Ligand SMILES: CCCCCCCCCCCCCC
Ligand SMILES: CCCCCCCCCCCCCC
Ligand SMILES: CCCCCCCCCC
Ligand SMILES: CCCCCCCCCC
Ligand SMILES: CCCCCCCCCC
Ligand SMILES: CCCCCCCC
Ligand SMILES: CCCCCCCC
Ligand SMILES: CCCCCCCC
């Protein structure tokens with residue numbers, strides 16, 4: 145399946161971060177840090193590059209909080 | 225544009241089901257869906273007010289909501305509505321731009337004096353649905369039609385009324401306190417199921433008429449009289465048996481006229497039969513034979529001429 | 541009688557104080573004056589009476605406006621045919637004394653006579669003729685049998 149676009153916005157839609165395509169172009173990653181007292185985040189994944197009816201494309205999404213080793217987690221999903 | 229302009233409204237309507245028709249009172253009832261869309265920066269909005277991208281109002285009319293936010297909105301009405309309207313899934317929702325839209329699923333009864341049943345059962349009618357804006361044309365105007373569904377939707381099984389074609393149109397009409405308002409009209413052209421009436425009424429009638437026609441070949445005039453008398457009672461019995469498919473409107477249709485003519489001819493058969501019996505009694509059998517030949521030639525010509533006359537005077 | 545259904549109800553006013561009211565209505569009205577003795581040849585009046593709810597020294601109907609045709613035309617036939625109409629202002633006694641204004645519209649109506657004539661009277665006449673003609677016969681058994689059959693035919697038509 146073709147690589148979709150990734151971005152991060154708050155609850156109102158204000159953009160905060162955008163996804164970077166790695167040199168081994170098989171994944172897209174994102175990173176952010178908290179400054180405000182309370183931050184509510186929304187993760188956007190979209191593949192509407194054009195109007196192609198590709199069909200049943202399926203992707204794997206991995207997310208983590210205070211987990212910089214997301215590339216090689218090894219442990220099963222912990223915490224919450 | 226130095227001159228401040230008007231607001232443009234997009235509108236759409238779809239019919240799910242015709243649920244009834246009152247031919248005496250002249251009204252019909254219908255189930256359907258209504259959709260309105262427009263854009264107004266005074267409805268603008270800042271997301272940090274709620275942390276949200278969509279503001280909405282539920283189970284309220286456009287008039288009610290206008291009275292809460294104290295800004296003018298495109299309120300409407302159904303022009304021919306009789307009594308109250310049942311509504312479901314009623315909602316208004318708005319974006320930070322001010323792009324707004326309204327949705328309703330409705331069941332409503334509409335007056336229709338344009339109905340005309342003279343040609344019954346061969347009659348054809350129009351079911352028209354009219355939506356009027358309740359505000360002047362310089363404030364809001366219907367500008368575009370949206371086809372969000374099939375305008376008339378399909379349903380399993382048969383229907384009493386068959387839609388032959390439809391259309392949808394925007395016009396403008398005069399308004400109280402002057403000026404003009406926009407109108408959106410949907411019209412369905414409809415006819416009845418003809419096979420039902422044909423097979424249920426006309427073939428048995430034709431056989432009954434044939435029964436009174438064929439008896440004139442007999443030369444025993446007592447048997448002819450008795451069979452004529454019995455056939456008249458059979459005719460009356462069948463007429464009151466089909467009386468359920470005979471609407472009581474207070475004026476004559478094609479079918480009532482045909483029934484009256486048939487009854488009159490059936491009774492004249494009995495009268496001629498009594499005359500021929502007397503003639504045979506007195507010993508003038510030749511005159512009775514000649515009357516038999518005349519009746520056998522004449523009666524189908526009379527029926528055919530009456531049918532031609534009815535066709536000329538009611539269908540052209 | 542009971543509630544009234546109303547549409548397009550509005551009041552509007554100008555800086556002078558010139559004001560006006562509009563309503564589209566559907567309403568059911570009691571009418572004991574009806575008299576059906578002559579049916580179907582009967583004739584009736586449909587009268588609509590509008591009364592002011594305030595004393596005549598406060599407000600009084602003073603002029604009649606013909607903003608449309610008083611009785612409007614419609615496609616197809618009607619059961620009741622309007623032969624003539626009229627409209628009039630009068631004054632009538634009021635609770636807590638004095639008097640109030642009244643505006644009356646009356647329609648004079650008749651039935652569609654051809655319907656009843658063709659549907660009832662001609663077949664009746666033929667049935668009566670059938671029982672009349674049989675007395676020319678001299679075979680009284682046939683006459684008896686035909687009379688007996690014609691009576692049943694008459695009853696069948698009556699209940700039809
Ligand atoms: C009236 C019912 C229809 C019966 C068919 C009539 C067809 C015309 C035939 C004419 C025959 C005349 C023979 C003397
Ligand atoms: C009763 C049904 C009407 C039939 C017509 C009667 C007309 C009067 C004719 C009188 C004839 C008397 C012959 C002895
Ligand atoms: C109203 C029908 C009149 C029919 C008269 C019949 C004359 C028969 C005498 C033999
Ligand atoms: C259903 C109507 C039938 C009427 C009589 C037909 C007579 C035809 C003679 C040719
Ligand atoms: C459109 C069909 C025309 C009908 C003309 C004949 C009617 C006969 C009397 C029922
Ligand atoms: C509903 C069928 C239309 C008319 C068909 C004629 C067949 C008798
Ligand atoms: C066999 C019955 C013929 C009926 C013809 C009249 C209806 C069109
Ligand atoms: C138009 C209805 C006429 C009724 C009687 C006809 C007798 C042949």
Ligand SMILES: CCCCCCCC
Pocket residue numbers: 651652653654655657658
């Ligand atoms: C509705 C018609 C009035 C009476 C006409 C008489 C014709 C039989």
Ligand SMILES: CCCCCCCC
Pocket residue numbers: 657661662663665666
């Ligand atoms: C006025 C109705 C009675 C006359 C009927 C004559 C039938 C041909």
